[PDB]
Design a protein around this ligand. Structure first.
Ligand SMILES: CCCCCCCCCCCCCCCCCC(=O)OC[C@H](COP(=O)([O-])OCC(O)COP(=O)([O-])OC[C@@H](COC(=O)CCCCCCCCCCCCCCCCC)OC(=O)CCCCCCCCCCCCCCCCC)OC(=O)CCCCCCCCCCCCCCCCC
Ligand SMILES: CCCCCCCCCCCCCCCCCC(=O)OC[C@H](COP(=O)([O-])OCC(O)COP(=O)([O-])OC[C@@H](COC(=O)CCCCCCCCCCCCCCCCC)OC(=O)CCCCCCCCCCCCCCCCC)OC(=O)CCCCCCCCCCCCCCCCC
Ligand SMILES: CCCCCCCCCCCCCCCCCC(=O)OC[C@H](COP(=O)(O)OCCN)OC(=O)CCCCCCCCCCCCCCCCC
Ligand SMILES: CCCCCCCCCCCCCCCCCC(=O)OC[C@H](COP(=O)(O)OCCN)OC(=O)CCCCCCCCCCCCCCCCC
Ligand SMILES: CCCCCCCCCCCCCCCCCC(=O)OC[C@H](COP(=O)(O)OCCN)OC(=O)CCCCCCCCCCCCCCCCC
Ligand SMILES: CCCCCCCCCCCCCCCCCC(=O)OC[C@H](COP(=O)(O)OCCN)OC(=O)CCCCCCCCCCCCCCCCC
Ligand SMILES: CCCCCCCCCCCCCCCCCC(=O)OC[C@H](COP(=O)(O)OCCN)OC(=O)CCCCCCCCCCCCCCCCC
Ligand SMILES: CCCCCCCCCCCCO[C@@H]1O[C@H](CO)[C@@H](O[C@H]2O[C@H](CO)[C@@H](O)[C@H](O)[C@H]2O)[C@H](O)[C@H]1O
Ligand SMILES: CCCCCCCCCCCCO[C@@H]1O[C@H](CO)[C@@H](O[C@H]2O[C@H](CO)[C@@H](O)[C@H](O)[C@H]2O)[C@H](O)[C@H]1O
Ligand SMILES: CCCCCCCCCCCCO[C@@H]1O[C@H](CO)[C@@H](O[C@H]2O[C@H](CO)[C@@H](O)[C@H](O)[C@H]2O)[C@H](O)[C@H]1O
Ligand SMILES: CCCCCCCCCCCCO[C@@H]1O[C@H](CO)[C@@H](O[C@H]2O[C@H](CO)[C@@H](O)[C@H](O)[C@H]2O)[C@H](O)[C@H]1O
Ligand SMILES: N=C(N)NC(=N)NCCc1ccc(I)c(Cl)c1
Ligand SMILES: N=C(N)NC(=N)NCCc1ccc(I)c(Cl)c1
Lengths: 48, 98, 171, 104, 83, 347, 311, 174
């Protein structure tokens, strides 16, 4: 019984991990812009 | 360096001075030896975790395990000293003076 | 040292996909299949360039595809999708396996109204190939020229001239 | 922050119960009514030291649930059994050397 | 065969706890090598995608690499669905 | 000790040393020292008496302190270079800490006080291990980290050791204390040449080990631990008195014996580096060692000290101790100088 | 809102401990052909209140201790740690959701032995110190099997998170694949909590007072309840319906109640182990089997292809 | 501020060390180490080391320090001496606290200090990583690698522990 359920749980983890992989490109694009915007903003106050 | 490193190194120095400045009890000196291990464990763990050195994450565990085995040997010597003299005073361990 | 070159605040502006994580999770499997091509192009750019400044335009296309993808769901399957991601959102772990009834309704709606086929288990974790016009970076690390190696000793090994030559020893 | 608050509450309440347990009205007006070898067996030392060494071994087995997720399962299973077998050999050595006896 | 059988009966009568311990430890060492399912544990562990699958630049001579996740090229998890 | 256990404990002393010698990771070097110290303690304790317990405790405290300092050096090195490779260290404070730790492990002056006391308090066979095999691992680390050692520090340790070893041995009648102070003096030569030519460090270490093993083995053969007890050898085993004489003269660095070769070679390397005062000071100071070696030859071989009547009973029994490799070691200890050019195998 | 939640854990824990004293006395009574408390309140329902008030207004006779700080420290540590053991328990939602909750409980429980040791030092009597050391030796000895048994179970669960035990047992209680470990786990908790037939602190001193006595007692009985709540989660996993979490809380409470009653049942049924005999039950019986079952439970998921997920 | 939690914990860390390093009665010295261990675990916790933090509690405090206290009660001190009663202990204790307070005060006033070596005082958070979004604990991945990568480490570690058992039985037989 534990073997059958654990195999199913491994399949459920793969499905959950693949949803993350589908979203990682969008999240990475967002993260890049947020980081660059933050650095740019610090550069204006540094100039002042 | 980072501010935390100031105090971790200070803790190691404090325990090293405690270790090198004996009083009477051997157990008090063995505690200082463990103090140095604990500060080494923290300093190593901080460095390894902050740098994201992934495979080095096991190193503090190995340090802990081996130094605890060292401490077990140290305690066993202390009880044998205590069985001989009835205390763990270092002043009793002066036969090899001559 | 030089000045860290940064793009302008306006060079970073773009329409943002302002939906919650449960909404993205509910659409993740269809989104992976539908927007794969611009997504993989962006991720290829990021891993080759190792510089977020060099893939901003590719990142804007990732956003555009995501918006158009969610505009198609909104036009056609707004109600089955809303019921589905609302079921995901209740769970503290956002579990797929607690929402199979609602997933089936959403899945059946996109297939009929858009022809969207949910990718199979294992598909979205495949390594795929991307055709890009972008040139391949040549020195992505900005490495300097490596030091020249030490001159290499070579020839035929001969006996030491007159032996060890150690003080008086003749061998 | 939550864990800190829970810990602070648990031991603060424990402290309050202890102090009030010591200082309650009593209604009385009159006056109220070193570092040697303790005589304790070496056997009890060996239990504590034996516990420590086994505890250090347990620390090494704790990562096993995570280690079973590796693709290098052949190596992982061999090393898990090696460590546990060595733990068993340790017990067998203490046992056959009368380290687990309480007589004498 | 018999002197060993006469040995086992003695330890089974005198030390059943130790006989069970050694029996279980032996099965823990032996059975993994005999089991036909052991090979699947390796495959399932490798099929779990913890990090992003970085795509390959297409140079025109990779016919075994899918262009789309829903293409028929690349590893399949059909074996896992049945398992 | 159960003989099988003794063997396994001895094999673990060796394994700890070998791990230090083959390791490329500082953590594994540290483990080798910890494993080695764990296994050595039982052989120091094996005769169960207060002196042995005091010796093991003093040894444990010294070695555990040194190993903590070594770990500290490793961790500082990690913070300032982000790697664990056994090689030059990348921080001067790490280099000092590791050098001091290895000096404590070697029993070099001014960290020497434990060597005479621990050696006195343990059996001869245990003292043989302590003064020979136990020098291998710390020396093998110095061999690798020397490009980053502070020259003034290492040469100060060398000079102090030669002085303290020479002076300390002048006042000893116990054989185990003589060998201890002799060991301190010889460690000074090994480290003095390390900054200039580590191969001569290996040569001096190897010849030191051979000669030291020969002395301990000859002491064990007759169960002698004091000068006066050794002075009875002439009336029991005259051949032994001659072998002791040759070995002591060799240990004194007299030509044409083997023990001259390390001093000869070390002086050569130092002069090639325009170091003239230090080698000359070293060679003259080593005459202190020669003095208390000669004193032993006088009471052992070159004169006949008084005997006892019960000694006659010993005439009727043969030596039964193993004396393993003694014939080979005594020949190497004395007759190797004509083969000096062979040192190049150590390159 | 979170402080409300903390109080709504602490106060019911202390009330449940109070009324476990009543339940233990009445269950023991009826197994002894008598009634137990039935005068102080209807069916003895006020007996715990009378006992609590009595103890706290009792004279706090503490002999001049050899260490004032360690006399106070021991009860604070005991009670403080006992309550801390409850904060990661999923019922079905934990107060604090720890990724390594199982490991947190193991680490905190290992600290509870200091209260035994410190109370021994503070007693200022070598006889009580020797009694403390015997209790410490028993406690740490059975910590060895509890940790190894727990590790063996988690090899089927896949993580150290306590709520993942709920998921692991969605189809079947873990007591079915692991009843040999459940047997030794259960007996180990008895010995861990110094419960009969392992109540050798009480028996040996036969052969503290007022509020400070009451506090050590409260901590002991809080630990007893928590151990049995842990056992139910570890081996008798209740199903969780996210839309009706109170059905989980009812079913899981009944299992924990029954397990706690079995502690009282066992206390009524057997004589006491000798000290050397409960030491042999651990080192020469449980530990060999636990080690062998630990080897088996590492191999089993690998050989069956039943390795659980990490997440 | 909670932005200085790591620094504050490290201040208590040092105070615990000056506590037992001044070497009062081994009973109180043991208490100082226990407090330092717990504070040290908190420091490791705030750097993302949950497992390593809990190992200090499980093994260092629940394991080694328990055996230290156990052994102290048996073969060293059965009843503590009054804390700070000896002048040498008090002088050492006060001296370490005075040194520590000066470091803390100066590093907080200037947000940096040069005690032998130069340190920054802006807060430890400044050096933290800014890009984590993986579906696992990296510390857990590293420690789990002991069984795939660290075969050699397991062999020598397991061997040393077994030898520790054999050795301590030899030492104590007497
Ligand atoms: C079986 C014979 C095999 C054979 O046929 O060929 C061997 C040889 C003939 O072969 P060959 O190739 O034609 O060489 C003969 C040439 O005339 C000689 O050939 P070469 O021109 O190449 O010179 C020999 C050469 C070869 O390389 C060697 O180093 C050989 C070392 C010879 C060892 C001599 C030790 C005794 C020293 C004098 C005492 O020596 C050197 O390289 C430099 C000179 C080494 C001098 C050694 C003395 C300085 C060392 C410092 C410590 C000792 C100081 C004196 C005390 O016959 C021999 O003479 C025997 C060789 C000597 C050693 C073996 C005999 C042992 C003698 C024990 C001496 C006892 C001392 C008593 C006091
Ligand atoms: C070029 C630089 C300068 C020259 C470099 C020289 C380096 C040293 C060369 C090697 C020296 C090894 C000793 C020479 C062998 C002579 C001993 C002998 O005749 O034993 C015969 C031996 C027993 O004779 P024994 O009546 O007990 O007395 C002999 C000595 O007292 C036995 O007393 P022991 O306590 O001294 O026995 C030592 C030996 C144990 O005794 C032996 O069995 C000799 C084994 C020598 C092996 C040959 C090494 C060369 C091959 C390299 C590979 O220890 C070993 O296990 C060998 C290491 O009979 C055999 O079993 C022969 C070995 C069978 C294999
Ligand atoms: C007693 C214990 C202490 C030992 C004595 C103290 C050392 C005394 C050293 C005297 C100075 C010798 C010296 O250092 O010369 C160094 C110098 C090296 O310079 P370099 O580059 O090689 O060549 C150009 C010359 N500047 O130039 C040289 O190298 C030339 C020197 C050649 C080697 C000199 C050998 C030692 C001289 C001192 C002993 C002489 C007196 C002996 C008396 C003994 C009587 C029994
Ligand atoms: C090159 C140098 C080779 C050195 C060989 C030395 C062999 C030992 C000398 C023979 C003496 C007789 C003997 O068997 O050794 C004694 C010692 C065992 O001690 P013992 O009291 O005699 O009996 C043990 C019972 N508990 O046995 C031992 O423990 C051996 C101790 C010596 C081991 C260290 C030898 C020096 C390091 C050599 C490595 C070179 C690199
Ligand atoms: C030999 C004597 C030993 C004595 C030791 C003491 C043992 C006490 C045992 C206590 C446990 C008894 C179980 C009490 C049942 C509680 C009522 C209940 O809700 O049962 C439901 C249960 C099936 O539902 P469920 O528990 O959720 O299982 C699904 C898997 N997660 O029911 C279906 O089975
Ligand atoms: C389900 C069963 C089916 C039956 C068929 C299965 C067949 C395959 C299994 C066969 C295994 C047989 C091996 C049994 C070995 C028994 C050894 C023995 O009987 O020794 C007992 C004795 C200890 O008993 P004690 O009471 O202390 O002293 C005797 C005085 N009356 O002497 C001793 O000192 C005990 C030996 C030392 C302790 C050994 C500890 C074992 C290792 C612990 C871990 C367990 C195994 C690995 C995990
Ligand atoms: C002499 C008197 C002796 C008395 C000693 C009694 C001991 C009382 C208990 C001490 C408390 C120790 C704290 C240990 C908590 C470890 C639990 C844990 O690891 O998780 C808590 C939290 C991280 O949560 P986690 O889910 O694991 O990871 C983050 C999200 N994935 O991590 C955190 O919340 C960070 C909290 C850091 C502060 C901890 C400071 C501990 C100092 C105690 C002394
Ligand atoms: C099937 C393999 C599974 C892997 C097992 C894992 C490793 C476990 C190693 C345990 C080794 C114990 O080895 C054990 O040694 C002692 C030797 O005194 C033997 O026991 C022997 O001594 C005892 C006294 O103590 C005698 O009463 C007994 O008659 C005799 O058999 C045991 O029969 C043997 O089992
Ligand atoms: C005192 C020393 C104690 C040392 C104890 C060491 C005991 C080791 C016993 C188990 C070792 C082998 O255990 C198991 O064997 C089978 C061989 O059929 C291996 O092989 C199996 O898994 C691999 C995956 O890597 C598959 O590719 C293969 O098809 C399959 O047969 C397993 O990878 C291994 O997990
Ligand atoms: C015996 C007591 C042991 C207590 C150990 C306490 C911990 C020791 C901390 C060592 C870490 C600091 O180590 C020290 O760091 C600084 C910069 O950070 C280095 O750098 C310093 O000296 C060099 C000189 O060329 C230059 O970089 C610079 O002038 C200066 O910053 C030092 O070369 C190094 O020695
Ligand atoms: C849990 C909350 C309960 C709240 C109840 C609040 C009630 C407050 C009134 C407390 C009454 C206590 O009553 C009093 O208790 C103390 C206990 O030390 C008793 O003992 C006291 O008096 C006797 C002499 O009479 C002394 O020898 C003794 O040393 C002293 O402790 C008194 O004999 C009793 O009269
Ligand atoms: N480190 C030093 N100062 N000396 C040193 N080893 N020099 C290297 C020169 C050398 C000398 C002899 C040989 I044979 C070889 Cl092959 C090489
Ligand atoms: N062992 C039993 N069950 N009976 C018994 N002697 N109970 C002790 C009574 C008690 C102790 C503390 C508290 I707070 C409360 Cl309320 C009651």
């Amino acid at each position: 019984s534990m073997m059958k359920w654990n195999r199913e749980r491994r399949r459920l983890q793969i499905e959950d991990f693949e949803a993350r992989i589908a979203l990682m490109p969008l999240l990475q694009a967002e993260k890049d812009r947020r980081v660059l915007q933050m650095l740019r903003e610090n550069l204006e106050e540094e100039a002042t | 360096m980072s501010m935390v490193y100031m105090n971790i190194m200070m803790a190691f120095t404090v325990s090293l001075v405690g270790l090198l400045m004996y009083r009477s009890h051997l157990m008090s000196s063995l505690l200082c030896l463990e103090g140095m291990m604990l500060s080494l464990f923290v300093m190593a763990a901080l460095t390894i975790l902050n740098s994201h050195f992934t495979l080095a994450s096991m190193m503090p565990i190995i340090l802990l395990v081996f130094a605890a085995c060292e401490a077990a040997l140290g305690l066993s010597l202390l009880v044998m000293v205590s069985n001989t003299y009835g205390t763990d005073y270092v002043q009793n361990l002066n036969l090899l003076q001559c | 040292p030089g000045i860290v070159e940064l793009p302008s605040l306006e060079d970073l502006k773009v329409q943002e996909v302002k939906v919650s994580s449960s909404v993205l999770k509910a659409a993740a499997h269809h989104y992976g299949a539908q927007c794969d091509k611009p997504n993989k192009e962006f991720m290829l750019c990021r891993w080759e360039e190792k510089d977020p400044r060099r893939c901003l335009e590719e990142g804007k296309l990732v956003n555009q595809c995501a918006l158009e993808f969610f505009r198609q769901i909104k036009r056609h399957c707004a109600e089955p999708f809303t019921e589905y991601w609302t079921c995901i959102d209740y769970s503290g772990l956002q579990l797929f396996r607690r929402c199979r009834k609602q997933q089936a309704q959403f899945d059946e709606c996109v297939l009929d109204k858009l022809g969207w086929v949910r990718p199979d288990l294992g598909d979205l974790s495949k390594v795929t190939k991307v055709k890009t016009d972008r040139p391949l970076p040549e020195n992505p690390y900005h490495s300097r020229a490596r030091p020249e190696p030490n001159p290499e000793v070579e020839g035929d090994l001969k006996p030491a001239r007159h032996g060890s030559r150690l003080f008086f020893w003749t061998m | 922050m939550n864990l800190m608050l829970a810990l602070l509450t648990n031991f603060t309440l424990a402290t309050l119960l202890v102090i009030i347990a010591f200082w309650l009205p009593q209604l009385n007006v009159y006056s109220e009514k070193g570092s040697a070898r303790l005589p304790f067996s070496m056997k009890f030392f060996l239990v504590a030291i034996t516990f420590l060494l086994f505890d250090l071994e347990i620390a090494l087995l704790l990562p096993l649930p995570w280690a079973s997720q590796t693709a290098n399962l052949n190596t992982m299973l061999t090393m898990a059994l090696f460590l546990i077998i060595l733990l068993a050999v340790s017990l067998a050595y203490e046992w056959t050397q009368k380290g687990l006896e309480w007589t004498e | 065969a018999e002197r060993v059988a006469a040995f086992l009966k003695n330890v089974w009568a005198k030390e059943p706890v130790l006989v069970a311990s050694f029996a279980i430890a032996g099965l823990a060492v032996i059975l993994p090598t005999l089991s036909p399912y052991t090979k699947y544990s390796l495959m399932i562990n490798r099929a779990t995608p913890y990090n992003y699958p970085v795509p390959l630049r297409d140079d025109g001579n990779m016919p075994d690499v899918p262009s789309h996740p829903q293409d028929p090229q690349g590893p399949s998890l059909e074996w896992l669905k049945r398992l | 000790m159960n003989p099988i256990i003794f063997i396994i404990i001895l094999l673990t002393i060796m394994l700890g040393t070998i791990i230090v010698m083959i390791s490329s990771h500082w953590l594994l070097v540290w483990i080798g020292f910890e494993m080695n110290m764990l296994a050595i303690i039982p052989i120091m304790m094996k005769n169960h008496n207060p002196r042995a317990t005091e010796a093991s405790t003093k040894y444990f405290l010294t070695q555990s302190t040194a190993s903590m300092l070594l770990m500290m050096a490793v961790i500082i090195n990690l913070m300032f270079s982000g790697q664990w490779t056994v090689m030059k260290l990348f921080n001067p404070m790490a280099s000092m800490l590791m050098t001091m730790a290895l000096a404590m492990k070697l029993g070099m002056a001014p960290f020497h006080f434990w060597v005479p006391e621990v050696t006195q308090g343990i059996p001869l066979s245990s003292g043989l291990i302590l003064l020979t095999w136990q020098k291998l691992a710390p020396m093998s680390v110095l061999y690798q980290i020397f490009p980053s050692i502070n020259l003034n520090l290492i040469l100060t340790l060398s000079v102090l050791s030669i002085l303290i070893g020479g002076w300390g041995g002048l006042n000893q009648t116990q054989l185990r204390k003589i060998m201890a102070y002799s060991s301190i003096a010889h460690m000074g030569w090994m480290t003095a040449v390390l900054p200039y030519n580590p191969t001569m460090t290996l040569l001096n270490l190897i010849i030191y080990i051979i000669m030291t093993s020969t002395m301990f083995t000859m002491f064990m053969a007759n169960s002698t631990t004091t000068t006066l007890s050794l002075s009875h050898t002439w009336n029991k085993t005259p051949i032994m008195t001659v072998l002791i004489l040759a070995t002591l003269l060799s240990m004194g660095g007299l030509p044409p014996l083997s023990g001259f070769m390390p001093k000869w070679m070390i002086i050569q390397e130092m002069t090639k580096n325009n170091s003239i005062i230090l080698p000359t000071f070293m060679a003259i100071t080593a005459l202190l060692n020669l003095y208390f070696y000669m004193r032993l030859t006088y009471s052992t071989t070159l004169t006949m000290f008084p005997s006892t009547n019960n000694m006659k009973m010993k005439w009727q029994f043969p030596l039964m101790k193993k004396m393993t490799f003694l014939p080979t070691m005594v020949v190497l200890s004395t007759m190797m100088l004509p083969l000096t050019p062979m040192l190049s195998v150590l390159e | 809102m979170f402080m409300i939640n903390i109080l709504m854990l602490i106060i019911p824990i202390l009330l449940a401990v109070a009324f476990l004293t009543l339940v233990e006395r009445k269950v023991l009574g009826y197994m002894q052909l008598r009634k137990g408390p039935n005068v102080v309140g209807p069916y003895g329902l006020l007996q715990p209140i009378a006992d609590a008030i009595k103890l706290f207004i009792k004279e706090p006779l503490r002999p001049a201790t050899s260490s004032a700080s360690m006399f106070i420290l021991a009860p604070i540590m005991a009670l403080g740690l006992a309550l801390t053991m409850w904060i990661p328990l999923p019922m079905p939602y934990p107060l604090i959701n720890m990724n390594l909750g199982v490991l947190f409980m193991l680490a905190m429980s290992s600290l509870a032995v200091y209260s035994i040791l410190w109370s021994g030092w503070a007693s200022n009597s070598k006889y009580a110190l020797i009694g403390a050391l015997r209790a410490v030796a028993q406690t740490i000895s059975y910590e060895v099997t509890l940790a190894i048994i727990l590790l063996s179970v988690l090899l089927m669960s896949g993580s150290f998170t306590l709520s993942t035990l709920i998921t692991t047992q969605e189809q079947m209680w873990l007591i079915l694949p692991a009843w040999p470990l459940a047997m030794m786990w259960f007996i180990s908790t008895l010995a861990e909590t110094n419960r009969a037939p392992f109540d050798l602190t009480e028996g040996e001193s036969e052969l503290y007072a007022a509020g400070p006595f009451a506090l050590f007692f409260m901590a002991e009985y809080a630990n007893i309840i928590m151990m049995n709540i842990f056992t139910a989660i570890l081996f008798l996993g209740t199903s969780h319906n996210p839309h009706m979490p109170e059905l989980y809380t009812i079913n899981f409470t009944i299992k924990s109640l029954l397990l706690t009653m079995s502690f009282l049942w066992i206390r009524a049924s057997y004589p006491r182990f000798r000290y050397d005999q409960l030491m042999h039950l651990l080192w020469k019986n449980f530990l060999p089997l636990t080690l062998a079952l630990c080897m088996w439970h590492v191999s089993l998921p690998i050989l069956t292809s039943g390795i659980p997920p990490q997440t | 501020m909670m932005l200085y939690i790591v620094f504050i914990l490290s201040v208590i860390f040092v105070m615990g060390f000056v506590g037992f390093s001044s070497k009062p009665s081994p009973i109180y010295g043991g208490l100082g180490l226990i407090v330092s261990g717990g504070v040290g675990c908190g420091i490791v916790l705030n750097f993302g080391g949950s497992f390593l933090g809990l190992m200090v509690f499980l093994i260092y405090l629940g394991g080694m320090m328990v055996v230290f206290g156990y052994t102290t009660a048996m073969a060293t001190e059965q009843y503590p001496e009054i804390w700070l009663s000896n002048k040498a202990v008090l002088g050492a204790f006060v001296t370490g606290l005075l040194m520590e307070f000066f470091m803390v005060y100066y590093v907080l006033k200037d947000k940096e200090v040069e005690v032998v070596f130069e340190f920054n005082g802006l807060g430890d958070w400044v050096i933290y990583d800014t890009g984590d979004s993986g579906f696992f604990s990296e510390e857990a991945m590293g420690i789990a690698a002991l069984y795939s990568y660290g075969t050699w480490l397991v062999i020598v570690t397991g061997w040393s522990l077994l030898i520790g058992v054999v050795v301590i039985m030899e030492i104590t037989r007497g």
